[PDB]
Structure formats: C-alpha cells, structure tokens
Amino acid sequence: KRDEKHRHVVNVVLELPTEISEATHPVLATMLSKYTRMSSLFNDKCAFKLDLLRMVAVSRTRR
Amino acid sequence: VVRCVRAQVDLGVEVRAARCPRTGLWIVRDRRGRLRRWLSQPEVCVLYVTPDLDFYWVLPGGFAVSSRVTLHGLAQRALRDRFQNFEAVLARGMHVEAGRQEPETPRVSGRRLPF
Amino acid sequence: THCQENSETVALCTPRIVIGNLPDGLAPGPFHELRTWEIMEHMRLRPPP
Amino acid sequence: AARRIPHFYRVRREVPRTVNEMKQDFVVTDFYKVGNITLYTELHPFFDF
Amino acid sequence: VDRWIRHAAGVERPQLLDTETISMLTFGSMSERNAAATVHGQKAACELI
Amino acid sequence: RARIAVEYVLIRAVRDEIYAVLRRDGGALPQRFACHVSRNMSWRVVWELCRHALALWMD
Amino acid sequence: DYEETLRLFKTTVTSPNYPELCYLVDVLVHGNVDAFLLIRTFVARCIVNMFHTRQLLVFAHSYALVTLIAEHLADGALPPQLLFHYRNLVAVLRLVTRISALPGLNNGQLAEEPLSAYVNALHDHRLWPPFVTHLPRNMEGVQVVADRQPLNPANIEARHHGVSDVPRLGAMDADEPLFVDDYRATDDEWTLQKVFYLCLMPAMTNNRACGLGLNLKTLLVDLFYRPAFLLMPAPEDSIAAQRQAVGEMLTELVEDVATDAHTPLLQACRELFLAVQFVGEHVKVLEVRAPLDHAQRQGLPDFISRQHVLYNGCCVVTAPKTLIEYSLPVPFHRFYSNPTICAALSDDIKRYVTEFPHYHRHDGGFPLPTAFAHEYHNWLRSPFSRYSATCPNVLHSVMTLAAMLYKISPVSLVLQTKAHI
Amino acid sequence: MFHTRQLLVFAHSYALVTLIAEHLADGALPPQLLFHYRNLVAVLRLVTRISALPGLNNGQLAEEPLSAYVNALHDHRLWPPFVTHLPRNMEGVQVVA
Amino acid sequence: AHEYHNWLRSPFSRYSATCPNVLHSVMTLAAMLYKISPVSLVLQTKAHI
Amino acid sequence: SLLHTFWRLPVAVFFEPHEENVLRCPERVLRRLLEDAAVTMRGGGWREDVLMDRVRKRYLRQELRDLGHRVQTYCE
Amino acid sequence: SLLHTFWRLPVAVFFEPHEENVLRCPERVLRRLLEDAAVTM
C-alpha cells in the first residue's frame, strides 16, 4: 500500500520529528505528492530537506 | 614516461638507443643527441618499445621487465584500417622522382593575395 | 677582540651578522635613516600612511 | 579539479618559476646587462616567447 | 650555496684536474677566454671595498 | 566499439603480459640498462613507486 | 573628491574582522534583483548597525551587492552619507570606464564589434570578470568549459526559482549541467563587473584578497532545520530562549550585526530565512576558451585563450571563522590568491605554506594549481600581480590598471595615435 | 583607562594586542579604540613588509627560504626576547637551561 | 655579558636612545637587521638597495 | 697551515652496472601485493567502455529531448 | 628487497654528466616520496 513509503519519506528519508504532522503543514502534503513519484535520490536526503525549506520559505511570503 | 609525484604520464617519447662498448647494457639518448637523464630520478618510471616490437619496462636503477608485445588476440583487418602509415599520392609540390628534395608546400595564404 | 679566558688573554673573531653591527664612526645613524627612506621609495611607500 | 584543488597541495614539492615571473623581478637599469638570463626569450613587443 | 651564488653571479663551475692544479701553482693559465670582439682594446678594473 | 577498443585491449594485453612475466620470474627482475646503483638505499619504496607508476599508466 | 570613500573602502577590505554572513548573503542572492528586494530591509538594518558599531562598510567584497544596494536601497530609511558613499563607488566605476573607453572616437562599429571593445580589454566580452554571477549577452567566440566538452549546446543551461526543482538540488555537485537564473548581463554592467573584479579590488587590497565558496547543500540543512523556521506564522519572551530556539550557529552569526533595539533575533533570522528560496548551486570553476578579436587574430590565428572564472563563488577578504566546516578556498587567479586565507581554510595548504615559507608572497608568486597554470594563455599576466602588490591605494593607482589593459591591436594603435596617447 | 585616563592598556605584548585586535574585534568596543590596535598590527605588517624584499625572495636554497638570508627579521634562529610559545622550526636552534 | 657572541650588538642600543619616536625611525631598526651573508649581498644590490 | 676549503672532485662509491646484477624481490610482501593488484583487474573498468557510456548517455539525452519535443507538439 | 650485485667490491665515480647520474636522492627524499605516493592515491 502507500503508508510505508510515506513514513519513509517523512520519517526515514526526510528525518522529520513526528509531531509536525500532516494537519500542521499543508504544503508538506503538496510536496509529498511529488516526492513519492520518484524512487531515487533517497541517499542525499539533505536535498529534500532544503527543498522543503525553500518551499516553506516561498510559501511564507506576503507577495 | 610516467611521473608519479606530479601524476603526469608521457605518451610519445622518441628516443635513440645504443649499446655500451664495455657492457651489453643499453644507453638511451635524445633524438638530438643529448643523454636522457630521467633514469636517475627515483619517482619516475619508463616503458620502452622497439621497432621490432620488443618490450622493456624500466624502474630506476636500470632494472627492466623484458618481454614481447602480444597481438595475436587482435584481428588483422581492424588493426590494419584503424591506424596505418600512409603512402602518398602525387600532388602539386612534390617530385615525380622518388626521394628527391621536396620544395615548399603550396600553403594557401590567409595573409597574402591568392594570385 | 681579546677575550679573557682563565688567566689567559686570547684573540677572538666574531662575525658581525647584520648591517647595524657596524660602528657609527664607520656607518652613522642618518645613513641608516636615508637608507630606509630609499627602501621605502623602492616599495612605493615614500609617502607613508 | 575545481573540487580537487586541495589534492594539488597534497604533494610536498614546489613549482618551478616560469619565465615571465623570472622577468618581472629585474629592476629597470640592469635588465639590459648580461646578468639577465631571459633576454633570449624577449624577442618582440607584441608577443611573449 | 656554491651552486647558487655562481649562478647568481653568472660564473660557471670550476673545471680542473690534478695535473691542472699543480700547473696553476707554478705558472697558471689563460683561464679567462678572450671575448669574441673587442673595440675598446683590453680591459682592467680592480676592486677595494 | 571494437574499432575503438583495438588499441585499448592491446594496452591491456601489454599490462597482463607484464603481470605474467613478473609472475613468471618470481619477481626478481635483472638489469638491462647502464646506470650505476647504490646498495645502501631502500628499494621497497622504488618498488612501490613502480607499482603506482604502472597503475597510473593504466589509468 | 572620491578620496574618503576609497579610504573607507581600503579600511573595510583590508580589515581582518569582516562580518561572516556577508559572504553567505552574497552566494545566497546571486545578484538576483527581486531576491535582493525580498531581503532589502534586512541588509539595510545590517549595514546601518554594522557601520555604527564599527567603521567598516560591509558587502563591499561583491560588485553585485553594492550595485543592487545603490540602485534599490536609494529610496531612504538610512543615514544619507552611506548612500552617498555607495553612489561615489558607482561614480568611481563610471569614471574609470570613461577612462578605459575612448569617448573622442567611438562612432559606429567594426566587424559587428564596437570600437571601444577593440582598444581596451575592459569593454570586450572575451575578457570575463573572475566572479561571474550571470552569463553575459555576448558569447560569439566564447566557449564556456565546465568539463571535457565546452557547453556550446545551449540546452544544458536552465534553472527555475520557487518551483521546488528537486533534481537540480540533488545535482548541485554535478559539473556537466549548468543552472543560470536567465538574466543575461548586458555590455555596460559587464564592463562594470570587469572593472570591479579586475581592477578596483586588487588595487585596494594589494592582492591580499581570496576567493572561496560554500558547501551550502550541507550548510543550510543544519542552519534552518530548527522548527522556529519551519513552523513560522503567516515566542520572543527573552533573547536566551530565542538563542536556544534558533540553534547555536545563528547566535554568533547574527548577534549584533542585524539586531537593532526594535527587532528581536528570531525575527531577523526569519527575515533572512525568507530569501532561501533562491538557493542556487555550488561553486564552479569555469574556463573561458575565447579567441581574440579579428585584429589580434592576424598574428597566431590558432592561439586559443583560456581564462578561469568563478561561478556562485564569493570574493573574500578574510577567513570566515565559523564557516570553516562548510567552506572551501578557491585560489584560481593571480588576483584573489592570498596564502594566509587558503592556509586558514584547508589544512594541507597550511602544511604546504609551513613547509615552503617563501610562498607567502602576495604578488602572484603563490603557486596556482595545474588547471590554472596557463599564464601565457591568461589575459592578465604576471606583471599585473607583480604591480598590484606594491601599488598605492590611490584613485590614480586604481585607474592605472584599466590603463594597462589597453590592447595592442593595430586599430588600438590607430586610436591611441589619433588621440595622441 | 581610555576614558578616565588617556592611555590604552596592554600595549606591551604582541601576544596581547593580536588577541585584542582579533577577538575583541567582534564587538563590545567603541571602534575608535579598535582602530588603534588595527593601526598597530597594520604598522607591524607594514614594517615587516620593508624587512624582506618581496620582489625578489622566491626560492629555496636550503630549508630556509630566500627571505631568511636577506634580513635577520625572517629567520627562525633570531628569537624575540619575550616568548610565550616555542617556534615551529628549531633546526639550527637549541635551547638550554 | 658575552656581547660579541650575542646576536644583536651594542650600537642598536646606542642608536635607540636618541632615536626619535616616529614610525620611520622604527623601520630603521627593521632595516638595520639586513644580514651580511653573500646571498644577502647579491639580494640587496639586485634591487639597487 | 690554515684550513681553507678547496674544490674537490665529487666522489661517491657505487656499483658499476652489469648484465646480471639482479634486483631482488620486495621481501615477498609487495610481491603478493602486486599479485593482488594484478588479479583484481579481471573484474573492473576497461577504459574503452567509458567512451561507449559517453556516447550512450549523449544519445539517450538527446533522444529523450527529441521525444519531449515530439510529445509537446503532439497535444497542439 | 636489497639487490644482488654481480660486482662484489664497490667502485667510485668521476660523476660525469655524460655518465648517467646515479640515484643521488637520499632516504629522507624517499620518505617524502612515499608520503606523496600514499597521499595521492
């Protein structure tokens, strides 16, 4: 099913502390929809980390 | 000529080779006539190959791995068309007589007039 | 010079290591001053900061 | 090599100085003397050799 | 340091033998090669610091 | 691929020819080239440099 | 009267206590203009606070920083003497590019090149500044070399911002794909960048500057991963609580340099966190293989000319202390190769200096690596680095470098002759 | 002592004034005071510029560089009269107690 | 008290008494430490010092 | 009677090279190490394959780019 | 490791440049070179 790879790309790959759930973070849901569409690059997880960091940067703009 | 301390190898070395009168060992020299002196340098190493396709591999101290080059595992026609020395056809500027002194090449100029 | 060993007077030679070791009677202070100003010209510092 | 430039300084052997660096050190007046060595490189005002 | 100073002063290395050395004691030699052309005649200038 | 590969597999043939002849003699190569030597000098490091040199030539 | 601005420039470049985050904001913005507009009041508060606590004027290491500051920050909200200082710096730029050009005889063009690009090398697009942030307009004979083949197919040059381009962030170490922010530099800002990085900087620093880059793919991921950045609204009870919330590294970076009495620390680091959406790439060393113009090509027509420039890199004047675990020095030119900085950053270069103490010379006598050893093929030969280590810090000693970049072409002989130069 | 008196303190140690000009240079000082220590280390750099000949000293005849032969202010055998740390290289040097 | 074997000789101390308190006078102490090696004697004059 | 130095000829005693002054094995240990370095090359790179990989990734890259150009102009 | 030389007693040399130079680098240079060979791998 889907939950094992989502808990990979949240906890195992992304190394997120679990108390940032889904309901606290909508653009996380908009990013895990495309993070799961690829299967490589799960060794260099810091690229995914700074990708979501620049995404939460660009979403939190007044413009 | 493979130079390990600078990680630079050498591919095309032309070298003259001879034998000493006192001993049967080899002496290598520049194509001008200068004595080749890299054998004293300990960090360097050299591979020699002869026109009759013998094989030497000399680390410093003159000691040499000695063998022949094997090529029976290669096809004749692939080696023959991949690279081959070329015999020339007669064009403008060369003698019809063989082995005569060649005059100047045609050398179409981007600097002079075409005339 | 003449060094003084134990009840002994011996000769003693010693290299003057640098240029300032010359006496001022042979090479005076203002000569050193002018030499330093020449060197300051040479490194383009003749107006100093 | 853009990453690997610490690997060049991993070795402990110095570089030979090039000719153009060997030409800049001469002061203006003795450059024409025989004490210079790189005069045989200087041939043309428009081309280094 | 003898290899560097002689190169810095533009002097070649000393080339001599054993029978050449004793013949410098009795007579000497014409060790200085004559110049290729001299328009000013012979030369002499000594030094005293 | 074969037309490219001809000289490279010739180089590989030369390399394992070296390997076979150093396995053949046991590893005690003689001298063929005229240059004097020194006994009081460690030849282990120039042997290691020879290994590194043939490696770098293969690269 | 541009003297005191150049005195402030000399005392801010030769200063050993340059604040560290000026290099990271330089590699962070990449001279992207709306990225600078997003970070605008942050750097305004930064330069005001840092100038008031210390008379150095920051961000002077980058051309792009000072030109965006002087063009966009010029509305107000700062004491006017600093805006005057930046306008005098760009006026110095204008004066020396007036000197380098020939305003008397620059009518028309020749072989689809303007005449001013034939007489002095500050106007030719073949010569490049060492710290490139954007590709120029003109790449006619220019070959840009990242690896074995030059990047003449133009389809390996693309980069988007704000779209979560995840594969290019995983390919930040990939040398073959190039990623530019599609703002092609025109000719006059190419001239100004060549002035700032060829001429003004080594004339002021006496060639004691260096060039480095950051490993920002593994730097920001332990710099913004604190949940005060991630869980931001769309705290501040005490400064110590903000210090433990932001992490240890952001404390000594942004302690006094941007925190005025009105804003707290966590607010200021949130505002700097706003600009991470333009992250760019790692630092690259590019090789320009352009030949000469058609006049100088008439002698030695097969003379290729190689010239090594930097991409996404930062010109630095000191060793950043708290970034030595994430930075790397790139001495790639006879300018910007200070052996003290390269000794302070990497260990083996310090070992190489301590075994060879005669390589501490700041005049370009420092050994460059093998991929930069084409000093006969360089546009800037060893007379330049020989001169710049001992030139004074005077405006005429600035413009003398642009004077020595007057080309040797027959048409430059005609032009300097008809002007009786 | 710059305000209630008119003398800057710790001007009798190189090993003090470097740490003042570097590690007290990160803040917590009026920059008028910091520029005096900056001018001191700039004076020292300017006068060690004049000691060697930076247009000439690029070579190694011995383990010592070229600059250690032209001036005594560049060789490891010459020691300052006050030390805190031993030098890096003591080849021709031997200390005795 | 072994002053000859000492590295820095006497007249440095003799010059430093009446030495004026200017920055150029500091550099006189610097350039009085130019060594008198033969290598220094070719290095000094090559820059016409 | 004074100790002046003079230029003596450079004397250093060596062994004259012969046809059989043989260099011995490297104490059997680097002999074995060179044996391992010899036999490890049966599985590894081949130095002519890499050019085939270069032309293969080039052709794959350009061919998928032409496929993208085809499919993008397929939906008009 | 050490070679087996045919000539037992060793022989001096006049050190001609026309003679091939004889391995003059001493053991500290070989220590430096083994360090270079170790660090370049």
Question: Which chain D residues are closer than 8 Å to H56 by Cβ?
Answer: 25
Shortest CA gap C7–chain I (Å): 17
Distance between CA I32 and CA C18 in Å, rounded?
A: 7
Q: Are G189 and G59 in contact (CB under 8 A)?
A: no
Question: A4 Cβ partners below 8 Å, 6+ apart?
Answer: none
Distance between CA A45 and CA A63 in Å, rounded?
A: 29
Question: Which chain I residues are closer than 8 Å to C36 by Cβ?
Answer: 24, 27-28, 30-31
Q: Are K22 and F37 in contact (CB under 8 A)?
A: yes
Q: How far is CA B76 from the centre of its chain?
A: 22
H51–I33: do the CB atoms touch at under 8 Å? yes
**By a Cβ cutoff of 8 Å, what residues of chain D touch chain H?**
14, 17, 21, 24-25
J19–B61: do the CB atoms touch at under 8 Å? no
J19–B25: do the CB atoms touch at under 8 Å? yes
Shortest CA gap J45–chain B (Å): 19
Q: Collapse the DSSP code of G117 into the 3-class scheme (helix H, G, I; strand E, B; otherwise coil) and give the result.
A: helix
Question: Which chain I residues are closer than 8 Å to C24 by Cβ?
Answer: 11, 14-15
Phi, psi of H11, deg, nearest 5: -95, 30
Question: G12 Cβ partners below 8 Å, 6+ apart?
Answer: G18, G56, G57, G58, G60
CA-to-CA separations, G362 to B43, B62, D9, H38, J12, in angstroms, rounded: 31, 44, 18, 20, 42
Partners of J15 in the beta sheet? F37
G23 half-sphere exposure, CB direction, 13 A CA radius: 30
G260 touches chain H (CB under 8 A): no
Mutation site, I8, I21, I40, I45, interface H, largest H CB count within 10 A? I40
Shortest CA gap D28–chain G (Å): 13
What is residue B90's DSSP assignment?
P
Distance between CA G278 and CA G181 in Å, rounded?
A: 9
Question: Which chain F residues are closer than 8 Å to K40 by Cβ?
Answer: 52
Partners of I34 in the beta sheet? H71
H and E: helices and strands count for chain F: 2, 0
Q: Cα(first)–Cα(last) distance of chain C, in Å?
A: 44
Angle in degrees, CA G72, G76, G78, rounded to 5: 105
C18–H72: do the CB atoms touch at under 8 Å? yes
Phi, psi of B47, deg, nearest 5: -125, 125
Which residue in chain E is spatially nearest to H60 when comparing CA positions? Answer: E4
For strands C8-11 and B16-19, give the pairing. unpaired
Residue identified by tokens 């120039």 is F46
Nearest to D24 among G173, G328, G383 (CB): G383
Question: D39 Cβ partners below 8 Å, 6+ apart?
Answer: D31, D32
G359 half-sphere exposure, CB direction, 13 A CA radius: 24
G55–H35: do the CB atoms touch at under 8 Å? yes
Q: Collapse the DSSP code of J25 into the 3-class scheme (helix H, G, I; strand E, B; otherwise coil) and give the result.
A: coil
3-state helix, strand, coil in chain F (%, to 5): 65, 5, 30
Phi, psi of B19, deg, nearest 5: -110, 145
What is residue G307's DSSP assignment?
E
Q: How far is CA A11 from the centre of its chain?
A: 9
Which residue in chain D is spatially nearest to K32 when comparing CA positions? Answer: D12
Nearest to C40 among H50, H71, H72 (CB): H50
Residue whose C-alpha is closest to residue H25's, from G256, G327, G339, G44:
G256
Phi, psi of H23, deg, nearest 5: -95, -20
For helices F2-24 and J29-39, what crossing angle results, to 10°? 160
| Burial (Cβ within 10 Å: 0-12, 13-18, ≥19) of residue G78 | middle
- Are K and C neighbours with ≥3 CB pairs closer than 8 A? no
Distance between CA G208 and CA C41 in Å, rounded?
A: 21
Question: Which chain I residues are closer than 8 Å to D30 by Cβ?
Answer: 46, 48
